[PDB]
RNA sequence: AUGGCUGUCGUCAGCUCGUGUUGUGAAAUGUUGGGUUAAGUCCCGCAACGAGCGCAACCCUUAUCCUUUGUUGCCAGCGGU
């Protein structure tokens, strides 16, 4: 469902940030000054969206491992339901500084995650005492809280969808070095560099993120067939 | 000129590494910060993610109960004193 303007101009995706907070590189994607707040010009959003949608489909058509990034609070579970529905990965909690570039080490910690889920899959934590077992639920729970829906990755992904390029620039900086293409919903408060397939507009509204993630969930599910 | 061995800082809680990242570089980050602890003890957060020597625990003794055994050990309950 590649939206054009209908529910786009109804959820508040045009919006942006204060003229006190705007980043100078967002000059071309601007139209509006409603009460000293920058409004994105949608005329170069939907075409840019569809071109990105096309390339995201190309990756998914060749069985590309798509990895989302919706780390912030008001996107947490939103990205999660919009990820496991399209059988792809996601980064909903704090990004582990040095995840992809430091894959050599995190791979071993994620190996531990599969192992720990094993004793809790059939129930063999009760072999030892309760408090000691309570300890392994603390680690395991925190382990699946951070590296949950990424445990079945197998290596480096190909499609990195990220929300709020300025707040999650760490993921972008790691995806720049590996030549891995990254797709971001760049806010007027963010920076378009680092990301090749930039998409201007808002990323703060809860309704708005469902518009983006909803549309991309479709592109992958059609590229699988 | 040394090995082995010991003292001291001090039984003070600190000392480092692999990988990644930042800086031309020495190095830094991790090991900073908010709390907390006898203790980088623990939690949360964090360009850091894990790991090692350390603190703890495991060790011996002491403090209560229990089982087994009853001599040269023991004396309640019964005889003889």
For the CA of A208 and the C1' of B64, the distance in angstroms is 68
Among A95, A99, A214, which residue's Cα sits nearest to residue A155? Answer: A99
Give the other-Cβ count within 10 Å of A126's Cβ: 9
- B46 nearest neighbour residue (CA to C1'): A97
Among A85, A51, A79, which residue's Cα sits nearest to residue A220? Answer: A85
* Closest nucleotide over all strands to A135 (CA to C1'): B42
DSSP character string of A39-91 = ---GGGTHHHHHHHHHHHHHHHHTT--EEEE--SGGGHHHHHHHHHTTT-B--
- B45 nearest neighbour residue (CA to C1'): A94
For the CA of A72 and the C1' of B49, the distance in angstroms is 20
H/E element, A160:
strand A159-163
* Closest nucleotide over all strands to A171 (CA to C1'): B47
For the CA of A131 and the C1' of B11, the distance in angstroms is 29
* Closest nucleotide over all strands to A147 (CA to C1'): B49
Tokens of A168: 């999650």
For the CA of A188 and the C1' of B81, the distance in angstroms is 111
The backbone torsions φ and ψ at residue A164, rounded to the nearest 5 degrees and listed phi first, read 60, 80
For the CA of A132 and the C1' of B49, the distance in angstroms is 25
Contact A90, A83 (CB under 8 A): yes
- Report the interhelical angle of A206-223 vs A46-61 (nearest 10°): 40
∠ CA A70-A190-A180 to the nearest 5 degrees? 60
Q: Coil, helix or strand for A38?
A: strand
Tokens of A95: 């990004």
Which experimental approach was used here? cryo-EM
Which nucleotides in chain B lie closer than 7 A to a protein CB? 18-22, 43-50
The backbone torsions φ and ψ at residue A125, rounded to the nearest 5 degrees and listed phi first, read -90, -20
Q: Resolution of the experimental model in angstroms, please?
A: 3.2
């Amino acid at each position: 469902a590649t939206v054009s303007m209908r529910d786009m101009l109804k959820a508040g995706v045009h919006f942006g940030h204060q003229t006190r907070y705007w980043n100078p590189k967002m000059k071309p994607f601007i139209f509006g000054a409603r009460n000293k707040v920058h409004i994105i010009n949608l005329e170069k959003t939907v075409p840019m969206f569809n071109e990105a949608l096309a390339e995201l489909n190309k990756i998914a058509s060749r069985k590309g491992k798509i990895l989302f990034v919706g780390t912030k609070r008001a996107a947490s579970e939103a990205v999660k339901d919009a990820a496991l529905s399209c059988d792809q990965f996601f980064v909903n909690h704090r990004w582990l500084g040095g995840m992809l570039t430091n894959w050599k080490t995190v791979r071993q910690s994620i190996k531990r995650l599969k192992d720990l889920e094993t004793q809790s899959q059939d129930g063999t934590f009760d072999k030892l005492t309760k408090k000691e077992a309570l300890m392994r639920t603390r680690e395991l729970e925190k382990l699946e809280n951070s590296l949950g829906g990424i445990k079945d990755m197998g290596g480096l992904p190909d499609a990195l969808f990220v929300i709020d390029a300025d707040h999650e620039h760490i993921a972008i900086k790691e995806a720049n070095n590996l030549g891995i293409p990254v797709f971001a919903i760049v806010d007027t408060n963010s920076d378009p560099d680092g990301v090749d397939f930039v998409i201007p507009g808002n990323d703060d509204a809860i309704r708005a993120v469902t518009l983006y993630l909803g549309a991309v969930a479709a592109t992958v599910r059609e590229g699988r067939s």
